[PDB]
């Protein structure tokens, strides 16, 4: 009965690291998307 809790605490730490990395990737993608949309809008505006 004394090893299950070790297993769960290790799993929780790994999940925290995972969500940290995923948040970094998400922020990068969000900035890229905003930049692309703004560039597309400006390009469409200039062509008229």
């Amino acid at each position: 009965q004394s090893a299950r809790m070790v297993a769960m605490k290790a799993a929780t730490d790994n999940a925290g690291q995972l969500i940290k990395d995923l948040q970094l990737i998400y922020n990068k993608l969000r900035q890229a998307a905003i930049t692309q949309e703004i560039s597309e809008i400006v390009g469409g505006a200039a062509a008229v």
């Binding site: 969000r30 900035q31 905003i34 930049t35 703004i38």
Partner: protein, 463 residues
């Protein structure tokens, strides 16, 4: 030698002058018959100038006559501005009479050169025990304030103003960039409730103002602080001045809004192309010279909880220290609520502060971190597993946590406690003695709400 309006689009106004009377960049113009000031932004040719209106533009029309001042926006400076409230143009809005002084200073000026820099990096003493030991300040630096409402920010501002006026005989300037009117009125009456109003000047810029006003309101406070710093008493000592900026993020937002209004191609994540240059030109006039020194404290808000965003990164390019307030500390009644483990300063370095100061700070941080680690085992697996040096660390960490609170000078009217202004030399002695284990028998409650180590001794001998 007069011009007239030829085009109005929103808050952008074009004025045409005569070919041998065209004004220069950043000059201020006056519309004849109204009360509106136009600031030049760029020239276009054939005597046409594109400007920005300070205020609302309802009721204007083409063909109105305008005359030039041949100078930038000049605001009144001196000691008569202490305790008053003014707008971006230097006009009273508190219904207390006109400003008495006649001296004026332009709000646009070059930063001091490389030859005028100070020859050392001194420290700014605050009197707060937690700040002076773990995140020490520095003359001419910039400090960012974190944490939202509910933990105490305005009170810290009061205490800093009062202590800097008391110890170093300095003054203060407060500039509000995009402030709520309700919270601003509450803050003004909060200062008036105490006796701090007579040692600080205000310039207010609110959210419902045109974006031009929210952009040129920090320069007025900067000019006032510059005049306060430059003037000298006998022997030419100079003065130390504190500048308060309501939110630099709203300064950036006003900058990009004005850039979008002028019609410039955006860069990176929607921001204006001239972000870093604008923020540097704002922060390059805040420095420590031979005569005096201007120090600034600004509130920082991280958009989208992402530090990689362009504006927080450009902010962090200049900050020498960051202070973060946590709600968990305030939940335990320890005030001021400043987290020791997350506040950082570039001055905490053995070269700058010395050997013993750095070592004491590092040891305190290590003890606090180890206590935080042992909290989980204490809570989950029970108390019995922890003894000897674990409980020694627990007791020392609890005593350290209690010892970080102190009464303030501005709260003496409410609770009656006069408050204390602990000098830096006293804190190091107390913490070094605590770490060595000399006070291992004193109860925890003796470290509560006390100024210095002698007060702890007195409380322990009473309790």
């Amino acid at each position: 030698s007069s011009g007239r309006i030829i085009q109005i689009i929103g808050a952008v106004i074009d004025v045409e002058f005569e070919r041998t009377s065209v004004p220069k960049i950043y000059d201020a113009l006056q519309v004849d018959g109204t009360e509106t000031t136009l600031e030049v932004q760029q020239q276009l040719g054939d005597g046409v100038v594109r400007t920005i209106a300070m205020g609302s533009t309802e009721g204007l029309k083409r063909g109105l006559t305008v005359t030039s001042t041949n100078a930038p926006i000049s605001v009144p400076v001196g000691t008569a501005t202490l305790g008053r409230i003014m707008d971006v143009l230097g006009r009273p809005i508190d219904e207390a009479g006109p400003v008495a002084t006649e001296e004026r200073l332009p709000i646009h000026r070059q930063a001091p050169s490389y030859a005028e820099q100070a020859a050392s990096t001194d420290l700014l003493e605050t009197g707060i025990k937690v700040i002076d030991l773990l995140c020490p300040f520095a003359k001419g630096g910039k400090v960012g304030l974190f944490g939202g409402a509910g933990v105490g920010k305005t009170v810290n501002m009061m205490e800093l103003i009062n202590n800097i006026a008391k110890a170093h005989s300095g003054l203060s300037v407060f500039a509000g960039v995009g402030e709520r009117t309700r919270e601003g009125n509450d803050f003004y009456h909060e200062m008036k409730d105490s006796n701090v109003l007579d040692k600080v000047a205000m310039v207010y810029g609110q959210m419902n103002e045109p974006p031009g006003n929210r952009l040129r309101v920090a320069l007025t406070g900067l000019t006032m602080a510059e005049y306060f710093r430059d003037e000298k008493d006998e022997n030419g000592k100079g003065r130390d001045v504190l500048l308060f900026v309501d939110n630099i993020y709203r300064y950036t937002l006003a900058g990009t809004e004005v850039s979008a209004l002028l019609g410039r191609m955006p860069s990176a994540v929607g921001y204006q192309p001239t972000l870093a240059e604008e923020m540097g030109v704002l922060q390059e006039r805040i420095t420590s010279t031979k005569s005096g020194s201007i120090t600034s404290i600004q509130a920082v808000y991280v958009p989208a909880d992402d530090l990689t965003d362009p504006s927080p990164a450009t902010t962090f390019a200049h900050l020498d220290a960051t202070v973060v307030l946590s709600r968990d500390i305030a939940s335990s009644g320890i005030y001021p609520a400043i987290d020791p483990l997350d506040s950082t300063s570039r001055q905490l370095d053995p070269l700058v502060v010395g050997q013993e100061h750095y070592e004491i700070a590092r040891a305190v941080q290590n003890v606090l971190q180890r206590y935080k680690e042992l909290k989980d085992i204490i809570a989950i697996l029970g108390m019995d597993e922890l003894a000897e040096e674990d409980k020694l660390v627990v007791y020392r960490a609890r005593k350290i946590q209690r010892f970080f609170s102190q009464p303030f000078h501005v709260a003496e009217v409410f609770t009656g406690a006069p408050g204390k202004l602990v000098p830096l030399k006293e804190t190091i002695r107390g913490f070094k003695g605590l770490l060595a284990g000399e006070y291992d028998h004193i109860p925890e409650q003796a470290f509560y709400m006390v100024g210095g180590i002698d007060e702890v001794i007195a409380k322990a001998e009473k309790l």
